[PDB]
């Protein structure tokens, strides 16, 4: 043993070794040490993991004939409202305070066999389009797809993005904004209905809860 | 050169009207993502510095008409930036082009393989997709059919060059 | 990470040039100095919502004459440590040292700050050039006006 | 799951996943989706490929 | 990033009093080693220059009471820096939390797995451990029970960043 | 479990017969928690409900309590009768070493039980049978936990908007 | 050994600067010049009782003009040998050359001494930066006030 | 550090007198090759720049007396630079030291293994070899015995440091 | 070959400094200029009788100002060939080019001679430092006074 002892740099110092602890003045059954692991458990009878694959939100807004110019926003949905509504699907979702959620959205317009127009269903992720936008420069480039509103019912999935590893839901007014945009005037415009009805169904494709709300 | 196997761009072209009538009609859709508008599309946000690119295009096309509207549709590629005012239906049937009746098939996806004489697409070199109705469109008393396309994605993407940021 | 070489990030205004020296620059692909898109890196940052990756900065200085290059330039970094260059330039590579996954670009924060010790006398210009590294990433879309 | 998650830089973002499309108000035989590939075909009865060798 | 499999820190939190009574009581213990006091702890002496760290915490908890004192104890983690004033016992039993009677189990070790939305702990992001007595504490005529915790070590430690030495 | 309360009662309320805590079943089944809001969606059906009580005491004091199910709601919370307490369906239990629970079925005159707008679902009470063990130098108030659980539920009609 | 780059150890006071030259510095992670914690290396040394490892020192000099850099700087070490740098800086790596296992940091000695030959005329500043090497070690705990 | 398996130095210490008598006697020999004299020894010519060294010492010891001279000799190592004026023979026999009668064994070789608390020998840290005669020396009427040692070599040599050439 | 770095062999006297230039130095571990032991290499050479091995010489020059460094220094060797350095130093490695086995150190000859072309004007100091190489050897003993 001399100065040529190789030194392995460790952070564990031997100034505190095995801390033994022994019961002295009473019985063990009266004095117990518990070793637990505080992990997050979603509840048993509810929690977003029941909505996995199922619908949790549904609206039916309307839009007029005069709003069917190119680019006009017809219907809008803030994801922070769709996830915090008054239905049973939402109230099970506002209990998740942080986690992951991939959400399916579907649109469906009821039309005659006469009229038929095309609509884009866009996911404005940074909420850069208020509902009073007739741009079409922004509509044409946003992520989404076009579909015909007479013979079809169009749906797609999108993942909620978080800068961190999970996504804090509590007090998060920046979860995205879904829009239905008009690309063109209707097929026929004379002697036609002056308003339409579109159904929106938001579903849960996947949910993970990394922290659950407790009172 | 940077290579991207799948490159989604979700760029939708302008929707083009067609009045009903017997006259032969053509709707031209150029596919030039380098073309700028009010907002920069997903293509320009990542590959606008390039001088030219290469890759197969995928286009979702859509024809919105009534249920009592008849037309024959020829979807025709145009490469090397040629201009066709009129088409010879004899030439199209000789090349085994198949027309589709929009009363039966009015939605589709067109794969456009890379074809350019120069070797790449650019600001000036781009493919065109022509929707050619030879017999016009036969619809109910003042109908307009609308043809709308969306450049969905670019498969097997490759790009070169480095332009100046103006 | 396909931009050819160092793109121009920022020129120091010709009023704060010889007056003492300290030059704070946020480590970001955005032209955060303007709280306008200048080059391709700024363009990619403005058309995306989030970013992570390494940035290679390089400060180039021009003096009145060669005699005015009285020392070699230094560059400090924080989230004080420094790196020393030569008398006419200084390179500094800044890896992603924030323990998150991504940082927001614009309206949807900095990876730190560089502090360039400016010259003190008889300098002509001080420019800063940036290279987007190799493990870079812009993981979203964001609408940017084309006007 | 922490900041040491390795990041693979991909250009495909999950802000638009599988776009399902379903027929609602009519029959399929009345509404079909065609998937074609617009390639160049030389004509059958003429075209320079007949002059090959001649 | 530097990685440490086992990192002992032996930091003891402030011991918190609880008077006996029927009112529901909560003792909050934040676990923020970046928090400075009079002396720098073993965590700060070696990893205070870091911007943020990651790793599982091990905490020795201790409840000192009399031998004739009854209480139910819910040890509850709180991540992502949320503030809970009141707990819903229905919610705790739905999440399968088990309470312990301090007249039978009043010493323990809590493993806290790494859970943070941002991706790491920091000066502002840290876990909390809440000792929640729903029925208060029933003790002999003026007793105060004391709850004391010690951050024992950090397992699977990882840390990044480089702050300025102020 | 679908419901949980923690009410309190004073030392001076520990006379024989006094009602300490009360719970209307039409409120426990229509509260604000997640367990209740899942239950207010059932408009009619069957439900057998478990109820458990638990009082936190020292090792000095110990008193007995009856946990009664007043099914026709004939005892307001300001009742010190004990004539009514002694005969109501329920059981006695010691509040220091024990935690007492029992099941009861909600009765309907018909075949199912209409839940919507039904303020006659029963009334659970905790009644004091005797003065405390020791009364000098003792706490002046106590804390009792009540946990209502579902033993069985059948839905014969569900609410739709 | 997780500190990013060269941290600032010591600036030479602007009175002993041009007066001849010799500059004795103890090879230690402690700010032994003060017989106050300055940077992260000093902080880690003050919160530990013992230390061993290699230290990478670097002296940076600033002259009035480039003409005043009349020679390249040298740095001597002892426990006389020297190393020669360039005209504006000099690096010197000092391995653990004491035949012990650890050296005490503060109240519970130096790994040697560097002697920097200072400039003799028309110099502006002389700073010394230190890097904790890679095979470094601080093997104890020690209480340090946080005031 | 430089390593030398065998390093001969052939340094002889000063020969120390001992008068005959009954008083207990001690002859101390420090083994400090860094100690300088009139001439530089083989150790200093090659390893004087070192701060400290390490290695086992080999020492040839010699006791020159008459043929009618009796004494018991205890050769005792002293490490870590302690000073012993008197020895406890009880302690030496408890440590199983064996004495040798110089009328039978008065020449030898002592292997000194490396033992130092600091980790190396130096100018100030060196081993000592003490020749302890507990009963004195019994010789013929004015004899002086002479004890002389020679540091023969250093086995498994290792050295570090770099001093200033003064 | 265990000496840390370049040890100081010889300083040129401040009278023959600016006067033209040529500087003959024998390639030997001995301070043959004195026909007194200066450093560790001289000490090892004086306490041995014979030597062989490679010697790494390095000449360091100091000028009045940077402008006086009008050329890069050269160093010639013989047993005329030269090596060219930079404007402030010149290194020259001299292997054992005598076809013998050993050369005597002192009273029991040189491995050649270096010729340093001295500066001609406005120089301040010229020093010569030597490194004992790696394949060095001192194969004898020799008595040297310690006074």
Residue numbers in the entry:
A (entry chain C): 2 to 216
B (entry chain A), E (entry chain A), H (entry chain A): 3 to 168
C (entry chain B), G (entry chain B), I (entry chain B): 6 to 40, 56 to 99, 117 to 145, 152 to 190
D (entry chain C): 2 to 55
F (entry chain C): 56 to 216
Authors' description from the paper:
Apple-latent spherical virus (ALSV) is a picorna-like plant virus found in apple leaves. The virions of ALSV consist of three proteins, Vp25, Vp20, and Vp24, and they show only a weak sequence homology to other virus capsid proteins. One protomer is made of Vp25, Vp20, and Vp24 subunits, and 60 copies of this unit compose one virion. The structure reveals that the three capsid proteins have characteristic jellyroll folds that contribute to capsid stabilization.
We have determined the structure of ALSV at 2.87-Å resolution by single-particle cryo-EM with a cold-field emission beam, which allowed de novo modeling of atomic coordinates on the cryo-EM map from a relatively smaller number of particle images with an improved B factor for map sharpening. The cryo-EM map revealed side-chain densities, and allowed de novo modeling for the whole virus capsid, except for three short segments (41–55, 100–116, and 146–151) in Vp24 and several residues in the N- and C-termini. The Vp24 subunits form a pentameric protrusion around a fivefold axis, and the protrusion sits on a base of Vp25 and Vp20. The long extension has intimate hydrogen bonds with Vp20 (0Vp20) and the main body of Vp25 (2Vp25), and forms β-sheets with them (between β1 of 0Vp25 and β9 of 2Vp25, and between β2 of 0Vp25 and β8 of 0Vp20). In contrast, a smaller number of hydrogen bonds are found with Vp24. Thus, Vp25 and Vp20 have rather extensive interactions with their neighbors, and Vp24, which forms the pentameric protrusion, is more loosely held. Also, there is a hump or protuberance of genome density beneath each pentameric protrusion of the capsid and a pore with a diameter of ~4 Å there. The structure of ALSV and observations reported here suggest how the virion is stabilized and points to a possible mechanism for genome release through opening of weakly interacting Vp24 subunits.
